[PDB]
PDB file of C-alpha atoms and ligand atoms in Angstrom:
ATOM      1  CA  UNK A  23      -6.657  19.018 -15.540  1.00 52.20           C
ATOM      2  CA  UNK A  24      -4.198  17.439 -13.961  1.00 51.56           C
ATOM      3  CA  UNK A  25      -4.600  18.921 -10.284  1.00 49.61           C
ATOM      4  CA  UNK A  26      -7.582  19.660  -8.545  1.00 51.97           C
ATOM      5  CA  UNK A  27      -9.251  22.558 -10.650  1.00 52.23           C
ATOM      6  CA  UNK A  28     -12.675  24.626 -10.826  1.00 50.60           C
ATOM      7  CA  UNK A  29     -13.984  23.761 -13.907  1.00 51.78           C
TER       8      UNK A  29
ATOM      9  CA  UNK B  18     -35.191   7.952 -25.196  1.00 50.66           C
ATOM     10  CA  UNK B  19     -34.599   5.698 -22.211  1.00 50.52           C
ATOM     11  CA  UNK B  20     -36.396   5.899 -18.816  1.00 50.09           C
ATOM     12  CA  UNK B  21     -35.263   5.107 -15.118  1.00 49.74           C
ATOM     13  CA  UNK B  22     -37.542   2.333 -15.204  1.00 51.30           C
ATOM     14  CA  UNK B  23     -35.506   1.008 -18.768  1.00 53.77           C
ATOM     15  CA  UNK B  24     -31.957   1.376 -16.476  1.00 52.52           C
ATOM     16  CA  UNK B  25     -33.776  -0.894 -13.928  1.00 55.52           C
ATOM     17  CA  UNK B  26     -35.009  -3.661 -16.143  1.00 55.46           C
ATOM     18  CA  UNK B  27     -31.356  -3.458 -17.885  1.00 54.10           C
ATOM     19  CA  UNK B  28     -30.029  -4.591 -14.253  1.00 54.20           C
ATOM     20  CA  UNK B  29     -32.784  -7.019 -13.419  1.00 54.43           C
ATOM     21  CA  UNK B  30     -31.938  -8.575 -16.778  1.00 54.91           C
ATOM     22  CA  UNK B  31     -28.413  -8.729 -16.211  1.00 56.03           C
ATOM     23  CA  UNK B  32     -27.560  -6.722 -18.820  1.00 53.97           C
ATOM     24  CA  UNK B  33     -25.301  -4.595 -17.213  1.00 52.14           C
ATOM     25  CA  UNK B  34     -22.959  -6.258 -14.562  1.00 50.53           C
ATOM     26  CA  UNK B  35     -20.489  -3.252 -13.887  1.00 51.21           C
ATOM     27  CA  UNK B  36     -21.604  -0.237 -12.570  1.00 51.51           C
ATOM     28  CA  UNK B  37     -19.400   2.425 -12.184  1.00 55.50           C
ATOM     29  CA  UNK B  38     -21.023   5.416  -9.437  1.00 56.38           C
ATOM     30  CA  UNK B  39     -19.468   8.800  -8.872  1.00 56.00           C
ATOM     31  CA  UNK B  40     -20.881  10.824  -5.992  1.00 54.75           C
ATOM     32  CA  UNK B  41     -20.663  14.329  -4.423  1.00 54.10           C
ATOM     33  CA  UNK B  42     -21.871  16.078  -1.695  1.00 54.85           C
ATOM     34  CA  UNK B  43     -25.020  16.276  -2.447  1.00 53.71           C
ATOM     35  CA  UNK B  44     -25.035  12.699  -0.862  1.00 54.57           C
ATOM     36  CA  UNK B  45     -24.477  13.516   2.358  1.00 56.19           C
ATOM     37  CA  UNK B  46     -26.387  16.593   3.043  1.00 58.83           C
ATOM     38  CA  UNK B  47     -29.292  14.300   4.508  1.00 57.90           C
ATOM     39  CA  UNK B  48     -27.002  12.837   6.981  1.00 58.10           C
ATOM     40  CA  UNK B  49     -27.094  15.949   8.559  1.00 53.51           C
ATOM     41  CA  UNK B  50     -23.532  17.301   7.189  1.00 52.65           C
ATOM     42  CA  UNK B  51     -23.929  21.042   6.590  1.00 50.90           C
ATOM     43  CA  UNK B  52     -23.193  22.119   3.061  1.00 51.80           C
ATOM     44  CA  UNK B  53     -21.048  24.711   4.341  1.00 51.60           C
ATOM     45  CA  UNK B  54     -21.086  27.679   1.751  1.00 52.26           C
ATOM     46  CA  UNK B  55     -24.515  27.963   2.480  1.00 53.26           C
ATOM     47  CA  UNK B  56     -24.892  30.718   5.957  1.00 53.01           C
ATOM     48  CA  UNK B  57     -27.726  28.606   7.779  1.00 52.07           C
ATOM     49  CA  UNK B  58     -25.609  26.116  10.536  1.00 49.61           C
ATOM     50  CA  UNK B  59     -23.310  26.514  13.269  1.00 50.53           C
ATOM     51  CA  UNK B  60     -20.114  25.557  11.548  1.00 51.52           C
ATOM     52  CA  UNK B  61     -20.855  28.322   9.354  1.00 47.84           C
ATOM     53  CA  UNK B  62     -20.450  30.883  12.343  1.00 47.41           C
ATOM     54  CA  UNK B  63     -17.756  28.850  13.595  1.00 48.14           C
ATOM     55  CA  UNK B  64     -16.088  29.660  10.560  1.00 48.45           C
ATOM     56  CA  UNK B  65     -17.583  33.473  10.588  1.00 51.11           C
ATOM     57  CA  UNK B  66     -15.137  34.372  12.437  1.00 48.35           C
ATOM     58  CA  UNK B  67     -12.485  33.841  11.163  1.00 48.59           C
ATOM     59  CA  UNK B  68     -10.113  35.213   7.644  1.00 45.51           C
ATOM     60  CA  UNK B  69     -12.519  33.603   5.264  1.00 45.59           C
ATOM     61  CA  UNK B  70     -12.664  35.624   2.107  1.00 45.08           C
ATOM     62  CA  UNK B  71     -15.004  32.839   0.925  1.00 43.67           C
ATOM     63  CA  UNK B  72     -15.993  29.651   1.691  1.00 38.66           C
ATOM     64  CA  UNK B  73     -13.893  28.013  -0.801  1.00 38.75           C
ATOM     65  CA  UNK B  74     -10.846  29.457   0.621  1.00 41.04           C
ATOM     66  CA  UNK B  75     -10.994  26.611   3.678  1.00 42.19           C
ATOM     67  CA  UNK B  76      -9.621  24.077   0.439  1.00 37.75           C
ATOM     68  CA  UNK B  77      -6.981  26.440  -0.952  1.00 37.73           C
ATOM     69  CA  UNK B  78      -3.423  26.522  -0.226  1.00 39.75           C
ATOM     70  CA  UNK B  79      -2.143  30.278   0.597  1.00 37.77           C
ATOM     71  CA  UNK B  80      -4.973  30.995   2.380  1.00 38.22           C
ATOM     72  CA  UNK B  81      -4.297  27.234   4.950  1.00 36.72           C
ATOM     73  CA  UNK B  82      -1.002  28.147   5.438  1.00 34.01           C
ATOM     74  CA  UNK B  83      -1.733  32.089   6.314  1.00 35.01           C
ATOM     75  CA  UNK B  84      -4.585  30.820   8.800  1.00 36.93           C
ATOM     76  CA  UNK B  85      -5.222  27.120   8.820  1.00 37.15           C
ATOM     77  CA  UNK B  86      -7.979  27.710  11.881  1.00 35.36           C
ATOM     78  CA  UNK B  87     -11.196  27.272   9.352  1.00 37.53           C
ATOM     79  CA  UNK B  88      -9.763  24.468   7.976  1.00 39.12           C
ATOM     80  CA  UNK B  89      -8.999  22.180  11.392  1.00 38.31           C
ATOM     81  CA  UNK B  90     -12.713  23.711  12.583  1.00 42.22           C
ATOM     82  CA  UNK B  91     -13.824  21.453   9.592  1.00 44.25           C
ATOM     83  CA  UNK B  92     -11.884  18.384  10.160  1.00 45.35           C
ATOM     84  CA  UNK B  93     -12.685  18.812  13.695  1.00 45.11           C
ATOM     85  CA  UNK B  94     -16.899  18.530  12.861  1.00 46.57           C
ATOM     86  CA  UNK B  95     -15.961  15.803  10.203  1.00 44.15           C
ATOM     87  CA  UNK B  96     -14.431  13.814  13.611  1.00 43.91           C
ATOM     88  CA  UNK B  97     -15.673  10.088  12.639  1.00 45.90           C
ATOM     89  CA  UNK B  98     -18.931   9.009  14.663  1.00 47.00           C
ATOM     90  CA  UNK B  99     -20.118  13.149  14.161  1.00 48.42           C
ATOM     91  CA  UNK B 100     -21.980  11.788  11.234  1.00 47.12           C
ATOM     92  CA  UNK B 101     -23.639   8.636  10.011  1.00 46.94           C
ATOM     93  CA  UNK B 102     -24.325   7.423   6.606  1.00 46.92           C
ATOM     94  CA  UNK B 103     -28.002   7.765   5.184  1.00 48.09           C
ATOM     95  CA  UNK B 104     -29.683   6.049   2.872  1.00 46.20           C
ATOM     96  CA  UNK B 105     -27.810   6.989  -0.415  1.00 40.68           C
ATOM     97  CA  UNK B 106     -24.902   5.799   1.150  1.00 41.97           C
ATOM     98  CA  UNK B 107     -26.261   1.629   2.086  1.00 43.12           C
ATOM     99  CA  UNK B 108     -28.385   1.775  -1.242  1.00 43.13           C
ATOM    100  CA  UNK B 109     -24.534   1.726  -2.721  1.00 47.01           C
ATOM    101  CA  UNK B 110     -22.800  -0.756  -0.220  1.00 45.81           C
ATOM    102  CA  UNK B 111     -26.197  -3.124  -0.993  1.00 48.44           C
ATOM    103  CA  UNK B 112     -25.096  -2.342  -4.496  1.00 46.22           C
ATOM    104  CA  UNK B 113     -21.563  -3.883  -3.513  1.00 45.71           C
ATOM    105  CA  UNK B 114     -23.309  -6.252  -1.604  1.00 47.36           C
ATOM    106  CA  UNK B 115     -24.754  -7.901  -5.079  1.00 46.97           C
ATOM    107  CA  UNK B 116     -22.220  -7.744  -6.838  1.00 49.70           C
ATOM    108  CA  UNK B 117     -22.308  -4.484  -8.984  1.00 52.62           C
ATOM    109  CA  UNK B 118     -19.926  -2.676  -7.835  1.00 56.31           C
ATOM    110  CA  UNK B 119     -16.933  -1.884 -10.226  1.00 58.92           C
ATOM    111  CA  UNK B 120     -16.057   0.986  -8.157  1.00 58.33           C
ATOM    112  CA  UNK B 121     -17.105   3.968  -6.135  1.00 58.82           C
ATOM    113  CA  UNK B 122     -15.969   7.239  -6.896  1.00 59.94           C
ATOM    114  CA  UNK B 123     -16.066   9.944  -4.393  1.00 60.67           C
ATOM    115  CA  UNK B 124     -15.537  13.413  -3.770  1.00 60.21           C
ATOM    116  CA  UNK B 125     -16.627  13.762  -0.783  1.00 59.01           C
ATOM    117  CA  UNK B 126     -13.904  13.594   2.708  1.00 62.17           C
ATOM    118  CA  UNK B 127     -16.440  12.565   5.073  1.00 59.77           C
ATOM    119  CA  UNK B 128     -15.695   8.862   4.825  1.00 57.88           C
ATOM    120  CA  UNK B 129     -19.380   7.991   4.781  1.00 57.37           C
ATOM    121  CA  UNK B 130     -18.732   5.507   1.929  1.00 54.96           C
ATOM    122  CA  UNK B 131     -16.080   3.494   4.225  1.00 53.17           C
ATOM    123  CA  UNK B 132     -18.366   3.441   7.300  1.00 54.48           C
ATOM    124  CA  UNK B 133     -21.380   2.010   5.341  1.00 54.11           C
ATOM    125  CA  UNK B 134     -19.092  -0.783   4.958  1.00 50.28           C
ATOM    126  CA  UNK B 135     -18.090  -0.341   1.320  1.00 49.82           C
ATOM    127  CA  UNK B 136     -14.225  -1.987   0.835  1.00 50.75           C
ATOM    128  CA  UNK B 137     -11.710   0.109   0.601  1.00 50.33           C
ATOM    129  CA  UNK B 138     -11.200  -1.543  -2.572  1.00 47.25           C
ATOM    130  CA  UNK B 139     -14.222  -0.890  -3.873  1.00 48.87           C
ATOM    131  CA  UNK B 140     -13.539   3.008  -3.225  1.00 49.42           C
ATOM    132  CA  UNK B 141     -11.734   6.031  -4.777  1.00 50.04           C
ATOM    133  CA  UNK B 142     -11.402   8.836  -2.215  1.00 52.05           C
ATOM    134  CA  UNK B 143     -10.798  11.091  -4.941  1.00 53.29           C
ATOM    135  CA  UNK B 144     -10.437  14.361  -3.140  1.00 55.18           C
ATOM    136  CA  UNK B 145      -8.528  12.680  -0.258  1.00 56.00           C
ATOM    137  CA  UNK B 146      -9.446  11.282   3.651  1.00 60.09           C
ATOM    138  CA  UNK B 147      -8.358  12.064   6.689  1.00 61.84           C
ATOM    139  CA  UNK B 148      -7.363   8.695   7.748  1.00 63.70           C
ATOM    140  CA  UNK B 149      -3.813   9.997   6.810  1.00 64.18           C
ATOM    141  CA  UNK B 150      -1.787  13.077   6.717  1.00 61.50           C
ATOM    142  CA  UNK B 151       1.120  14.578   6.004  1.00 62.03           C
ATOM    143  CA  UNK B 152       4.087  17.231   7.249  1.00 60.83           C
ATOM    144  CA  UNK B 153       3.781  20.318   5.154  1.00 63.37           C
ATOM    145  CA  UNK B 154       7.531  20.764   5.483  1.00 63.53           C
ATOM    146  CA  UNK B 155       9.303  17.398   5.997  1.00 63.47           C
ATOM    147  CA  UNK B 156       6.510  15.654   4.255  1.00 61.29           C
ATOM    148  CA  UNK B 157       6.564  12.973   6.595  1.00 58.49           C
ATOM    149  CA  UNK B 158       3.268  10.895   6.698  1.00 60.52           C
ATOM    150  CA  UNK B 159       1.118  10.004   9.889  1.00 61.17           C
ATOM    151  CA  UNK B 160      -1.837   8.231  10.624  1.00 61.03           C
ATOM    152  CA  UNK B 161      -4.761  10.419  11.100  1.00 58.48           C
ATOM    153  CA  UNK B 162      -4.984   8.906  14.638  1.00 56.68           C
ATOM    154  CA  UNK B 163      -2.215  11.048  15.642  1.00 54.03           C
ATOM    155  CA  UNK B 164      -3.339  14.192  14.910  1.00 53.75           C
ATOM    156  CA  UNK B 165      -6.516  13.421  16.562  1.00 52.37           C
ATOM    157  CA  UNK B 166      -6.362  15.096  20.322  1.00 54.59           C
ATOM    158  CA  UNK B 167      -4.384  18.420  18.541  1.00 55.69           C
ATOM    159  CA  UNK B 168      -7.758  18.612  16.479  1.00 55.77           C
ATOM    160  CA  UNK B 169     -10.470  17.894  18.731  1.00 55.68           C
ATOM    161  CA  UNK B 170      -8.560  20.287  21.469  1.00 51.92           C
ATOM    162  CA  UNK B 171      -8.567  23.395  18.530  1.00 51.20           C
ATOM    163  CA  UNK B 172      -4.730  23.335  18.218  1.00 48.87           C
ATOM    164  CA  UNK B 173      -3.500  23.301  15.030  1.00 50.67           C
ATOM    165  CA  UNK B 174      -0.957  19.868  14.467  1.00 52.17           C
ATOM    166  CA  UNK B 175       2.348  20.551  14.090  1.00 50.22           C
ATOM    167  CA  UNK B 176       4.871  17.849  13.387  1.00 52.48           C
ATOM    168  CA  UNK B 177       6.973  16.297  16.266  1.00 56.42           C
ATOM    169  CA  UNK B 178      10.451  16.252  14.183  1.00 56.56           C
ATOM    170  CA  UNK B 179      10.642  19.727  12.559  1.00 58.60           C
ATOM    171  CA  UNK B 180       7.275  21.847  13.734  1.00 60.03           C
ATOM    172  CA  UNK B 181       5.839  22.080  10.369  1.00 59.58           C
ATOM    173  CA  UNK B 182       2.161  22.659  10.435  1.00 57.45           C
ATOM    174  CA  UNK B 183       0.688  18.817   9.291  1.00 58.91           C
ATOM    175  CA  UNK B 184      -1.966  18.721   6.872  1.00 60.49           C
ATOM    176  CA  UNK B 185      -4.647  15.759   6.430  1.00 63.19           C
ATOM    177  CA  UNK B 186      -4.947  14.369   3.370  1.00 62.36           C
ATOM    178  CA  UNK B 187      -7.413  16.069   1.382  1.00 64.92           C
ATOM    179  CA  UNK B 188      -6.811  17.317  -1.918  1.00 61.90           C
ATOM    180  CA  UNK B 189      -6.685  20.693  -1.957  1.00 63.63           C
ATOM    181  CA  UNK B 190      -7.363  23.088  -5.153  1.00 59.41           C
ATOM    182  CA  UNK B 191      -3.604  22.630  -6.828  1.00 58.13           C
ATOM    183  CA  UNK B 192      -2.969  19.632  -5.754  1.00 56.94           C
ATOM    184  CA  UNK B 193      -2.983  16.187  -7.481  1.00 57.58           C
ATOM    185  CA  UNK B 194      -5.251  14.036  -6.570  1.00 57.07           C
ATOM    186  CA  UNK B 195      -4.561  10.610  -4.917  1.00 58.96           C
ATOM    187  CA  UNK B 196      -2.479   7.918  -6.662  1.00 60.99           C
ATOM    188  CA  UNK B 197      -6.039   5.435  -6.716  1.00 63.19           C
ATOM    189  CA  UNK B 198      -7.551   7.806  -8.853  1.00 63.80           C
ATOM    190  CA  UNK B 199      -5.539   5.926 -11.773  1.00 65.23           C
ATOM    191  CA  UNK B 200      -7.901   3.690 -11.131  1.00 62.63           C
ATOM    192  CA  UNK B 201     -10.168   5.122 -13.800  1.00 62.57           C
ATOM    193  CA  UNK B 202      -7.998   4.597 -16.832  1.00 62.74           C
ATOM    194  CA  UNK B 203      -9.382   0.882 -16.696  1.00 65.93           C
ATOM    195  CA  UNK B 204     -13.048   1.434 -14.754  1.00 70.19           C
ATOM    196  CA  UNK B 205     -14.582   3.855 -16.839  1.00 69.49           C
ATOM    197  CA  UNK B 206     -13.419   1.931 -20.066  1.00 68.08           C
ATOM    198  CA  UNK B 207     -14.339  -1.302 -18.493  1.00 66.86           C
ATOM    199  CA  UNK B 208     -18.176   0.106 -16.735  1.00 68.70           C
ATOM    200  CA  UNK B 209     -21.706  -0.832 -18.511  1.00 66.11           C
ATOM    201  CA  UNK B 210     -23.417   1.504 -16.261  1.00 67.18           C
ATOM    202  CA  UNK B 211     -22.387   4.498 -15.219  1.00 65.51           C
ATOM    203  CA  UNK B 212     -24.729   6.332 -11.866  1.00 63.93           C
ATOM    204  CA  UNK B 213     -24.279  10.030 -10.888  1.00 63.42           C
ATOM    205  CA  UNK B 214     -25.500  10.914  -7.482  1.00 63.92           C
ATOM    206  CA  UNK B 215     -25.451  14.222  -5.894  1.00 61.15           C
ATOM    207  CA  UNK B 216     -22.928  16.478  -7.525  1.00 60.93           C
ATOM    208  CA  UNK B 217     -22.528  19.435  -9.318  1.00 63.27           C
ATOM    209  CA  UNK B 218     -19.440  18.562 -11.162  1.00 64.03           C
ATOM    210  CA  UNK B 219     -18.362  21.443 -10.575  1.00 63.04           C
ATOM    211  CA  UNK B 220     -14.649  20.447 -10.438  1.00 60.14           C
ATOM    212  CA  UNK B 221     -12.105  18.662 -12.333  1.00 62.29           C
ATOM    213  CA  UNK B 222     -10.175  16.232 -12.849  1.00 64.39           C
ATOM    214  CA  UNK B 223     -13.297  14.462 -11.259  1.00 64.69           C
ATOM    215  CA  UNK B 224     -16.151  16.183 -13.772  1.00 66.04           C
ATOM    216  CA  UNK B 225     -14.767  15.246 -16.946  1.00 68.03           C
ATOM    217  CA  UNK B 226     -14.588  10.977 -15.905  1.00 70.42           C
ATOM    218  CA  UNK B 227     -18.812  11.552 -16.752  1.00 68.34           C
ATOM    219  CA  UNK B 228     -16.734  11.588 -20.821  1.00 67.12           C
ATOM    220  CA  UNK B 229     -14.539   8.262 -20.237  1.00 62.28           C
ATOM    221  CA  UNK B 230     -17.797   5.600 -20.451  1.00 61.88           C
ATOM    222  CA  UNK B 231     -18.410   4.489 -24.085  1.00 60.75           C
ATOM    223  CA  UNK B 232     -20.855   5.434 -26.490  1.00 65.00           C
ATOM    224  CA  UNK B 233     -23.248   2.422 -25.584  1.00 63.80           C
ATOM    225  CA  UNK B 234     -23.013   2.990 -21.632  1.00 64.79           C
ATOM    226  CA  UNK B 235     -25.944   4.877 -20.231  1.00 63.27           C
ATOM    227  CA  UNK B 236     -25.212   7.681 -17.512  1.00 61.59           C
ATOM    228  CA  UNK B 237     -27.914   7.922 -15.294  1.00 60.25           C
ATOM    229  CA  UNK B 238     -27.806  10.996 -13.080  1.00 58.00           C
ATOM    230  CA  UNK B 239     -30.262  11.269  -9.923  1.00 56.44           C
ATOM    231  CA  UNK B 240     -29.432  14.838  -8.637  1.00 56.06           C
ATOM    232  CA  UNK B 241     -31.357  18.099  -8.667  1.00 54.67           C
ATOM    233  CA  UNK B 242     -30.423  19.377 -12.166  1.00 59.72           C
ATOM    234  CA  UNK B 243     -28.398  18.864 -14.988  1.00 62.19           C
ATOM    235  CA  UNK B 244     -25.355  19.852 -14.101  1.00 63.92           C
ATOM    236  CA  UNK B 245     -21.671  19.497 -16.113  1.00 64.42           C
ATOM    237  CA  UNK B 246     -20.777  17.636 -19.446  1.00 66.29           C
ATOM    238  CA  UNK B 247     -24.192  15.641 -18.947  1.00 66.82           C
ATOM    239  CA  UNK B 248     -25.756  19.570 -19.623  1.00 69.98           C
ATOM    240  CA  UNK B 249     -23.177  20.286 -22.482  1.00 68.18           C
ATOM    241  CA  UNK B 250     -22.766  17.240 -24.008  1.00 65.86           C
ATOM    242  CA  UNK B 251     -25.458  15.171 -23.913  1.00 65.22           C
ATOM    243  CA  UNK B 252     -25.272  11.366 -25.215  1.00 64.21           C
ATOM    244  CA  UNK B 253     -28.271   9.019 -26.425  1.00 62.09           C
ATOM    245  CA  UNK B 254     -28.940   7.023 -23.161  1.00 66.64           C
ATOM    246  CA  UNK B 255     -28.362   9.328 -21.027  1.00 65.20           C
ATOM    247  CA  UNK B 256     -30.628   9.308 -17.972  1.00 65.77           C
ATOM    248  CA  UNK B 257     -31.584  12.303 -15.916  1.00 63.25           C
ATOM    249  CA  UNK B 258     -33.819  11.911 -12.731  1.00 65.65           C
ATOM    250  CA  UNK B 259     -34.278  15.268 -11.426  1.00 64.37           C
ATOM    251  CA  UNK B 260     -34.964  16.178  -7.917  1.00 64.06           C
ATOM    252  CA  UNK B 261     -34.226  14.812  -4.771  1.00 65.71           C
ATOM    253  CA  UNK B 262     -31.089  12.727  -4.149  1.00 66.23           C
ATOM    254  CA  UNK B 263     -32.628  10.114  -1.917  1.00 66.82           C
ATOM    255  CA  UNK B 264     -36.197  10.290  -3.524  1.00 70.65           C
ATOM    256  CA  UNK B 265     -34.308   9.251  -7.107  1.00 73.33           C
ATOM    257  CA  UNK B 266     -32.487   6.536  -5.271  1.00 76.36           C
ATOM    258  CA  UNK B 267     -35.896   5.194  -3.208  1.00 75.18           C
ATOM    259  CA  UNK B 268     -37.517   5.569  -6.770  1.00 74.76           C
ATOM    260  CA  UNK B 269     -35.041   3.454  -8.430  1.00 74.01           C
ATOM    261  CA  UNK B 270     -34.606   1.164  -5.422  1.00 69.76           C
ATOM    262  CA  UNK B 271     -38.054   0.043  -5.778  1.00 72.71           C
ATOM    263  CA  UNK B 272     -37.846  -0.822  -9.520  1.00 69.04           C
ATOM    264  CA  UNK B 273     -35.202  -2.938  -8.708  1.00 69.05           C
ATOM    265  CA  UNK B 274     -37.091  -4.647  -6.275  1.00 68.75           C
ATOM    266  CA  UNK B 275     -34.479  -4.109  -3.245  1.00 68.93           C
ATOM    267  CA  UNK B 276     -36.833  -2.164  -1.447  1.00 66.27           C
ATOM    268  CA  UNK B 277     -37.501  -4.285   1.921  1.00 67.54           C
ATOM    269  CA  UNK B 278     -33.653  -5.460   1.664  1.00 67.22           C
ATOM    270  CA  UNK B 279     -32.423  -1.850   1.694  1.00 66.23           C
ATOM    271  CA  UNK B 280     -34.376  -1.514   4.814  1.00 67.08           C
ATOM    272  CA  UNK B 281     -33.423  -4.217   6.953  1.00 67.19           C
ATOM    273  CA  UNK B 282     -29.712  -3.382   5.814  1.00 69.66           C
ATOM    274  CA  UNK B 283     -30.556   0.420   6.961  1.00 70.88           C
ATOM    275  CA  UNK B 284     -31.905  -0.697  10.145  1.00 70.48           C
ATOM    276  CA  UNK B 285     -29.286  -2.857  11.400  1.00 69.17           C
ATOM    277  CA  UNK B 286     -26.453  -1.030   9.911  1.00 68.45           C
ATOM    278  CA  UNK B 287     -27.277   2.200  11.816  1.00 65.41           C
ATOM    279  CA  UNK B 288     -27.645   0.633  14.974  1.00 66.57           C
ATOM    280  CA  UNK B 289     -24.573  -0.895  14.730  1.00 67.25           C
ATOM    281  CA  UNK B 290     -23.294   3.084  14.754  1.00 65.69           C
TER     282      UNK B 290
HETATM  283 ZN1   ZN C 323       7.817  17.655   9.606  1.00 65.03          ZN
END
């Protein structure tokens, strides 16, 4: 991810 | 294969001189700060009632700009001096202190790390600070000094050139994260230690830097469970102390020998505060 994401 | 007491000697031997640490919020729960999806404390019914679908929803986009309320109630009990740093927190600037410290990096936004007197360039607020912010329209930035009386008085800051609702600093969920966070293309490549504290890695970009140590580095996580790629991809010295966040560190302290050091830094550091 490039932006902040929920994995 | 190895033991916390094998990632001790491999310090006291000076094999490893670069220790890379990545921490989450599981640091700072003992310092009082309220994990806040869980219903028990009073910012939770602060936040009850408002719009909250969820309690995620205070670090998402659509829902800030329909209602940022829940969102300034949080940076408003995040207020620096609310809050001091425990022991996780000086076990890592006495870290920095001898000379270990490749970096720190952080998820958390309660700038805990900064007031234990870790350097800023020792640190990567990865999901942001509010020591700045920023117009949502004009994108204009301000130090977080400014928006300081609008927060602690429950207004919500608005900008003083075009009225735009100004947001703090913290990375959001879409949003990239802060330009220092580059940072890790060299640290992680250049660490012989890497130390987990207190996080579910539960989110990425910042989950997937556990990957970016080589082969030969051992990851030593002190958390309650194994939690992200250190579950699903386990490597050869990887190191998992299971339990409580500042009984692993005390543990570990110990082996190191710091233990009476950590305490007079503890003791005069909080009364300092
Ligand atoms: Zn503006």
């Amino acid at each position: 991810a490039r932006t902040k994401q929920t994995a | 294969k190895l033991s916390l007491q094998d990632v001790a000697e491999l310090i006291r031997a000076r094999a490893c001189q670069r220790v890379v640490v990545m921490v989450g919020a599981g640091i700072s729960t003992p310092s009082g700060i309220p994990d806040f999806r869980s219903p028990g404390s009073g910012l939770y019914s602060n936040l009850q009632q408002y719009d909250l679908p969820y309690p995620e929803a205070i670090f998402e986009l659509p829902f800030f700009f329909h209602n940022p309320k829940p969102f300034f109630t949080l940076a408003k009990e995040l207020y620096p001096g609310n809050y001091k740093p425990n022991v996780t927190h000086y076990f890592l600037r006495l870290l920095h202190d001898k000379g270990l410290l490749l970096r720190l990096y952080t998820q958390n936004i309660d700038g805990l790390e900064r007031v234990s007197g870790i350097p800023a360039s020792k640190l990567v607020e990865a999901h942001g600070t509010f020591a700045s912010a920023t117009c949502t329209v004009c994108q204009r930035p301000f130090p977080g000094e400014d928006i300081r009386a609008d927060v602690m008085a429950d207004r919500v800051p608005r900008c003083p050139v075009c009225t735009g609702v100004v947001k703090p600093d913290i990375v959001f969920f879409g949003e990239p994260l802060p330009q220092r966070f580059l940072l890790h293309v060299v640290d992680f490549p250049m660490a012989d230690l890497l130390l987990i504290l207190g996080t579910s890695l539960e989110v990425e970009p910042f989950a997937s830097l556990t990957e970016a140590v080589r082969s030969s580095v051992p990851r030593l996580l002190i958390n309650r469970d194994l939690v992200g790629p250190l579950a699903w991809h386990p490597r050869s010295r990887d190191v998992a102390q299971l339990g409580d966040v500042v009984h692993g560190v005390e543990s570990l302290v110990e082996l190191l020998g710091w233990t009476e050091e950590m305490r007079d830094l503890v003791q005069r550091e909080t009364g300092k505060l």
